[PDB]
Write a protein that binds this ligand. Structure first.
Ligand code: UDP
Ligand code: UDP
Ligand code: 3D1
Ligand code: 3D1
Lengths: 225, 217
């Protein structure tokens, strides 16, 4: 019986670092990266995904729908094989969810006009459908940082394509993160999700070698599920 | 147990007509129309407006809309389910062509073929065919039946597009040259009927043949 936690948050808040911290604290703990993050920097999968990322960055109003499609189906399959292959008290740690795909990223491209009524309408259906047709999660852990901490972090990361991402986007993605995971205001069609329990974690301070409290906070919340 | 038979055919080759014609003949005989037929209506219209913009998006909605429709009907004594085209049609006819005519790029094309390879590796689950019936018509023929059908946005279909498509049908369903990542398919028997002659009020010969074919599977 595998528990299922999603680790969520804005660009450069510290998810993969956190995910690769818990990684070696237990062998009942496994981690599934987010596919997009491997296409992000530096095989047929990587080829395509990196092709798709650059195009979405260069002309989002043309490539948002295809990007969202490939990136969600990639997380989906990446997530399926981690039931297969590995894991007494097993937890799987997901690096973002198919819900972030949709209520954070996909949603923001509609409202910014990068996907049109048809595009976004056809995405909501596929999504609803592809997901109803094993990965529903036991909990969500929210690593909350500011747009500014987020903005500084991507600069410390130094990714080519990401240096141009401006504070105003991050500022939109923070708001949706907030409405979903803290005031629990955002409303959806995965109903269980309205009451999956969530833990919010302040990672504005650097925790790269001072993380015991955050982890005790994780261990405690696992205990409550 | 429900036998699954796809009616393949170029545009307006007779497909919708023969399949309904069939629909009345037997208790044991039902049909799943092509969802693009009823069209989807914007995505199809955007498809005719600017195909190098919408080809990828349509193909995905088109094909998944057919998988849903077919599954739905996947739930008589000697059951036979007839489909109107199929997910091989969607990939080796249409997406293939559309990649071939640069309305999709390699990324697009690779990303489609992977998603089709996967959307249907969980879903051969009675969408896998028992036979194919190829309504072979000449392109010339199909071009008149499009004026026959007298359909708005379908009026300007060239002469040459319809050519592209039949050469692809014939390589797939008559010469059997064409190769795919469903090894089963190359097994599967095909039946090949000529439909240039009208048949609305003269189909017994046709249906007789259908009947021999089903009888041997
Ligand atoms: O406590 C931390 C967490 C991370 N980072 C740095 O911020 C950048 C982005 O973090 P990460 O890739 O883990 O963020 P994610 O997008 O996965 O949330 C990397 O250079 C990290 O080393 C940091 O300076 N202090
Ligand atoms: O023997 C026939 C077969 C078809 N049609 C007509 O050809 C047009 C297109 O037929 P259908 O929708 O069956 O073509 P499909 O696209 O479904 O192959 C319609 O007006 C049919 O009435 C016809 O006149 N004689
Ligand atoms: N669904 C998605 N998942 C992950 N990233 C997304 C997604 N949509 C857009 N992006 C943008 C954020 C970064 O610029 C870049 C790398 O994450 O892609
Ligand atoms: N998968 C598909 N199924 C049926 N039609 C397709 C498909 N892809 C493109 N087309 C084009 C042909 C017609 O002009 C128009 C209506 O059939 O759509």
């Amino acid at each position: 019986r595998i528990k299922k936690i999603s680790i969520e948050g804005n660009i450069a808040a510290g998810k993969s670092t956190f995910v690769n911290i818990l990684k070696q604290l237990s062998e009942d703990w496994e981690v599934v990266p987010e596919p997009v993050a491997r296409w992000s920097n530096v095989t047929m999968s990587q080829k395509n995904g990196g092709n798709v990322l650059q195009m979405m960055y260069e002309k989002p109003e043309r490539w948002s729908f295809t990007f969202q499609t490939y990136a969600c189906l990639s997380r989906i399959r990446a997530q399926l094989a981690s039931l297969n292959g590995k894991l007494e008290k097993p937890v799987l740690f997901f690096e973002r969810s198919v819900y972030s795909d949709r209520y954070i990223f996909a949603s923001n491209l509609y409202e910014s006009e990068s996907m049109n009524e048809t595009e976004w309408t056809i995405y909501q259906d596929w999504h609803d459908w592809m997901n109803n047709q094993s990965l529903e999660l036991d909990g969500i852990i929210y690593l909350q940082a500011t747009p500014e901490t987020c903005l500084h972090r991507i600069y410390l990361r130094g990714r080519n394509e990401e240096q141009g991402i401006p504070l105003e986007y991050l500022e939109k993605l923070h708001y949706k993160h907030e409405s979903w995971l803290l005031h629990r205001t955002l409303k959806t069609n995965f109903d269980y999700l309205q009451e999956v329990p969530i833990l919010t974690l302040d990672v504005n301070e650097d925790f790269k070698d001072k993380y015991e409290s955050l982890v005790e906070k994780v261990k405690e919340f696992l205990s409550t599920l």
